Design a binder for this molecule. Structure first.
Ligand SMILES: *Cc1cc2c(cc1C)nc1c(=O)[nH]c(=O)nc-1n2C[C@H](O)[C@H](O)[C@H](O)COP(=O)(O)OP(=O)(O)OC[C@H]1O[C@@H](n2cnc3c(N)ncnc32)[C@H](O)[C@@H]1O
Ligand SMILES: *Cc1cc2c(cc1C)nc1c(=O)[nH]c(=O)nc-1n2C[C@H](O)[C@H](O)[C@H](O)COP(=O)(O)OP(=O)(O)OC[C@H]1O[C@@H](n2cnc3c(N)ncnc32)[C@H](O)[C@@H]1O
Lengths: 441, 441
């Protein structure tokens, strides 16, 4: 339990995304599950809130005055090739999970970025490059080991505590900290994917075709569109530097033949500054988004879920987020539907299953820039479900009403009840917080 | 000691490049140095030859009737950040070395392909993407642990056995099997590199400019040119498929500013089908050549060293290896000079230091194809040093005269003497073999 101004406090308290500028009263760099339970026990004695950080990818509330458990040293993974499952400790990032599953020819339902904490991602739902085919990562869990608000370790399956197994798979840490989880693995060894990086002048054309194209693709095709002003930086090749880029991401988990057939029409649009679409070992999946996770940064994230992508919706995005807009934020359009739209084998509380698309924005916190982001998301409200994707929400989305928007009204009702039952003092509240039901007080 | 038709013989006997179709009398999958010494002791009892394989990247002679030591399980690496050195076990591939050195911001002098066995590469010399700046990997060794032909383990430094330290660093396994080595590490954290992938019609223009360009670059710029008929395969992006490609590889180990300045003129040539030149973590270095090492293959490798690349030399390469040639082999032109051309701090036997370029060919063994390869290398003999790069030699280069061409005449004289002294029965002869001096009998 490091305290402020002790050696390595800052090390253990600060994550990748610093937008929640937070100062925990103590930080425990847990080495194992016992240290996690001990940290939680301590906090319960001191009537203190408890938060958990594996990477700092997903900030929400300030950890001021809280105990923060840093799980980054708990990076254990083990694979059961026979049963096609992996055991993943609290702090294991997907890159490490992939190291272990690839030798067997197995893939988890990981996301766009290998740097991301597998557990935090999963308990938000977890929308990746196999998701349109298989669903949310939270829909494919065998069991959980959990530190509950009394500081007890508990093994949990759909069998032993339905309520808790349901709530944790989409509820983040609101019901306890996950020390390890057992996930189903899938026989995926290769992807046909990469990017079509179009010049700015093509943005309207591309987004219009994309809106149509997505209506015909199978569930094996995950795809998204990034719109970004790229700086003149050496970290990207010369065709992408210092200009507006519309980047179409492909991730087809079937045969390259099929993928290429689907993709080929998109090439008739242009000009294409760079084309990386290719057959790759699934291990290389993190090259499709190639998201920078080396330096810490501050970013204000916000997203809305779209019931549909229409011409007029496209035109708003072109106008407020395309080349001439001069928007100082990145915009990403991610395709959902498919398996995401169908109820999971084993129920969970993951919301937004009716969404066709996620529309995401990432912004340096600066008032002119945040205004334009606001204007863009407001102008899309008519094509919006009212929902937000929880894993793509940011530090501005911390109020109870903002968190409610991540769940269906019924799921949230039930979640409030379960929360009262498993976290009566609302100890896990350094998070996208589900408040205890008022009826349970 | 697996024998033929025992479970896992084929596993342990066959490597990546199968061009030496070899059947060892026994294969020892050594777990540690003691098993290696025991294997060598056994062979010395039985008057049998001994070969060593970590990956099968570098075949030469058939292992028929030999004992083969497979070192692939000896993959240990440890790094001394303070002293900037790594300890590398026999079988460790560069990818694993890189895993350990990158967290400290250190780089070994590895080569184009992370799949390659660090030790085998180094004892051939070892020409990589930092070589023009720092020299051969064999020029930066602190010590070796070696199993000599009596089966004894021996720690060797420039201090304790000058003759042996000299000979092993360029002599491959001719003087004993290396169980571990201690290499100097360099403070390189990033490269500016990648490819300019030009269409076939530009090949003459590019090779002519390259010939000139290389005369002005600093030692921080490693570069090469691949000429290849790419099949219509899904493993490469659509611009590179089913056509002739001239691929210019850049690897600048200075500041991106400097790299870009150097590279920019090359873009004035064209058309460029794809441009990947960018600032990257040095860990990603294996993306510059992106050589396929997943499937085994058969390949007949041959190279000649060039004293200079002239217009007429270029025109022969264009004519016999460029788009209209219909050559069924790959051709690679690699730039040497720089630190390679200067004597190493601590002497070694690595030859070809006077070469400006390596010209390499890789061929499926088929007589029409091998004829054209022969014709190309013969037609370049006037611009040739007479030498060959040992690490780039193949199964056709196994005769004493072919191996002599890898060393200066004096070095080879001395090498024959040392060989008689350390391997009097020529036990290590499943290799590019240095025969014992006749004067020592
Ligand atoms: C940064 C980022 C995030 C990201 C992404 C790409 C990047 C560059 N791509 C995603 C994608 O393709 N699909 C997706 O669904 N999400 C994606 N994300 C977001 C990511 O899922 C979330 O940010 C998630 O929170 C990441 O978890 P991580 O553990 O890495 O992050 P954290 O800040 O350290 O923790 C955030 C919250 O996660 C919950 N959490 C963390 N550990 C636990 C444990 N052990 N038990 C229970 N809950 C846990 C907490 O709520 C914590 O506050
Ligand atoms: C396949 C390949 C090779 C390669 C390369 C790229 C690819 C795809 N790029 C290279 C590069 O950029 N620069 C360079 O200098 N060489 C490059 N190579 C060639 C490589 O250096 C050689 O092929 C080398 O022989 C590789 O060694 P490896 O150990 O991987 O290969 P092997 O077939 O299993 O062994 C070949 C011979 O190496 C000597 N050897 C191997 N292990 C030992 C030990 N422990 N002690 C002593 N000698 C050893 C033997 O002579 C063995 O026969």
């Amino acid at each position: 339990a490091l305290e402020p101004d002790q050696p390595g406090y800052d090390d253990a308290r600060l994550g990748l995304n610093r937008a929640a500028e937070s100062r925990p009263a103590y930080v425990v760099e847990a080495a194992d599950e016992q240290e996690v339970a001990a940290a939680v026990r301590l906090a319960a004695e001191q009537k203190r809130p408890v938060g958990v950080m594996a990477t700092g990818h997903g900030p929400s509330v300030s950890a001021d005055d809280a105990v923060l458990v840093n799980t980054r040293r708990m990076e254990g993974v083990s694979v059961d090739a026979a049963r096609a499952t992996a055991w993943i400790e609290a702090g294991a990032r997907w890159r490490k999970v992939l190291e272990h599953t690839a030798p067997h020819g197995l893939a988890p339902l990981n996301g766009s970025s290998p740097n991301v904490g597998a557990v935090g991602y999963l308990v938000g739902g977890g929308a990746g490059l196999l998701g349109r085919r298989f669903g949310y990562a939270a829909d494919h869990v065998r069991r959980l080991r959990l530190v509950t608000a009394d500081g007890r370790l508990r093994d949990v399956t759909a069998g032993t505590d339905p309520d808790l197994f349901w709530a944790v798979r989409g509820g983040k840490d609101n019901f306890g900290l996950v020390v390890g989880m057992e996930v189903d693995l899938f026989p995926v060894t290769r992807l046909y994917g990469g990017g079509l990086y179009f010049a700015g002048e093509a943005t309207a054309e591309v987004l219009h075709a994309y809106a149509e194209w997505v209506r015909h693709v199978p569930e094996e095709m995950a795809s998204s569109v990034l719109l970004v002003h790229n700086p003149d930086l050496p970290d990207v090749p010369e065709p992408l530097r210092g200009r507006f880029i519309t980047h179409l991401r492909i991730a087809y988990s079937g045969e390259p033949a099929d993928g290429e057939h689907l993709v080929r029409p998109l090439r008739e649009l242009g000009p294409i500054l760079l084309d990386t679409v290719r057959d790759m070992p699934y291990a290389e999946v993190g090259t499709i988004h190639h998201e920078p996770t080396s330096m810490p940064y501050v970013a204000y994230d916000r997203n809305v879920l779209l019931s549909d992508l229409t011409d007029d919706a496209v035109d708003i995005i072109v106008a407020l987020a395309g080349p001439d807009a001069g928007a100082p934020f990145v915009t990403e359009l991610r395709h959902f539907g498919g398996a995401y739209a169908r109820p999971p084998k084993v129920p969970n509380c993951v919301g937004g299953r009716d969404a066709a698309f996620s529309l995401f924005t990432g912004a340096v916190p600066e008032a002119e820039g945040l205004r334009r982001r606001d204007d863009l998301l407001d102008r899309l409200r008519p094509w919006s479900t009212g929902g937000t994707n929880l894993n793509f929400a940011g530090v501005e989305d911390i109020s109870p009403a903002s968190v409610e928007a991540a769940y269906t009204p019924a799921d949230f009702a039930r979640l409030r009840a379960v929360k009262a039952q498993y976290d009566p003092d609302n100890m896990f509240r350094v998070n996208f917080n589900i408040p205890p039901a008022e009826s349970w007080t």
